[PDB]
Design a protein around this ligand. Structure first.
Ligand code: NAP
Ligand code: ZOM
Length: 316
């Protein structure tokens, strides 16, 4: 058994997920070994995406742990994400089908709209003109969502959701005429320096699960993250809490999310930190401790993706 939450479509999501993004200089081989370790350690929720360029490896890990009797497919919750070069409705299903072929899985548990700003169709994830300008595309996300709904109806994705949506863009989906399925989640940056209370409360009021990424303060990979930004795991209050509970600042930060009703992702390619992260289920925080963590909030957004700034659908 393991801790899950009931999503608004009746499906269940394990409340701790393993993140599989690594900076490109990290060889892809490490993704295979890390996912296997995450499964061995007790992760039952694995988070990937087309744009991470690791689905062949992450799929192999999963296949391998099923084929060796370590786990059953129904006890893995696997998430992929529709990249912005495939927002046009007629491209959505082929994108999912391509991810499924790379993975050699029959279905994904969750398929998200990865980012709300669209770019031109093609193999290139960030297509650029001869002058280096990003090739933006104009697409109605409500049609993109209809095509997601059809992928759910075909059993290719058991659930569908969004990522890096803001209040306006969620409402756009929720208030859509002929809406068949709400998004089960909104996967966004969330951690003690950016606790997203406002958007969290919104998602709760609509029974949408907030899934927290960069819950440990992110890769801090340049140019995506300003190396001046504060180091989450170095916070004195988190480090004090960690010492007091004989845990780590990372564990405190993960536990914080679980108790506030957020599903939390943790990336690590390190065998010891992978095993350590599942200890989030071994302790609990008091109301006073949770309030202290709430006080760390400083509106620090690490991941702006501001190369996609300009178009109306840029969410930040
Ligand atoms: N939807 C989106 O747009 C989006 C955006 C960003 C991320 N994500 C998803 O969210 C996942 C996680 O976010 P993210 O990669 O920024 O990083 P995240 O998990 O905050 O972690 C950042 C760093 O923490 C380290 N770490 C892990 N456990 C630790 C521990 N117990 N003690 C000290 N350090 C620890 C990792 O290094 P080691 O590997 O060396 O342990 C990693 O570099 C991604 O892998 C991806 O699946 C989605
Ligand atoms: C697009 C994108 C968005 C995210 C945020 C996330 O979900 O973590 N990542 C990590 C990427 C890439 O991997 C990426 C791949 C190829 C190129 Cl050229 C640029 C970025």
């Amino acid at each position: 058994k393991y801790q899950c939450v009931k999503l608004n479509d009746g499906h269940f999501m394990p409340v701790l997920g393993f993140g599989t993004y690594a900076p490109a200089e990290v060889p892809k081989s490490k993704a295979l070994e890390a996912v296997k370790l995450a499964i061995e350690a007790g992760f039952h929720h694995i988070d990937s995406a087309h744009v991470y360029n690791n689905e062949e490896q992450v799929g192999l890990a999963i296949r391998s742990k099923i084929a060796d009797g370590s786990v059953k497919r129904e006890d893995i919750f696997y998430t992929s994400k529709l990249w912005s070069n495939s927002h046009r409705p007629e491209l959505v299903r082929p994108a999912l089908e391509r991810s499924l072929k790379n993975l050699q899985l029959d279905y994904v548990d969750l398929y998200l709209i990865h980012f709300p700003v669209s770019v031109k169709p093609g193999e290139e994830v960030i297509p650029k003109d001869e002058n280096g300008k990003i090739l933006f595309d104009t697409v109605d996300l409500c049609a993109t969502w209809e095509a997601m709904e059809k992928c759910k109806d075909a059993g290719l994705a058991k659930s569908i959701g969004v990522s890096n949506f803001n209040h306006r863009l969620l409402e756009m989906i929720l208030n859509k005429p002929g809406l068949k399925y709400k998004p089960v989640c909104n996967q966004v940056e969330c951690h003690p320096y950016f606790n997203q209370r406002k958007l969290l409360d919104f998602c709760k009021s609509k029974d949408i699960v907030l899934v927290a990424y960069s819950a440990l303060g992110s890769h801090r990979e340049e140019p995506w993250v300003d190396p001046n930004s504060p180091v989450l795991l170095e916070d004195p209050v988190l480090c004090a809490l960690a010492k007091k509970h004989k845990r780590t600042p990372a564990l405190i930060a993960l536990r914080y999310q679980l108790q506030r009703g957020v599903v939390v992702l943790a990336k690590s390619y390190n065998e010891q930190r992978i095993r350590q992260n599942v200890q989030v289920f071994e302790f609990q925080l008091t109301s006073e401790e949770m309030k202290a963590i709430d006080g760390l909030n400083r509106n620090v957004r690490y991941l702006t993706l501001d190369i996609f700034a300009g178009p109306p659908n840029y969410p930040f």
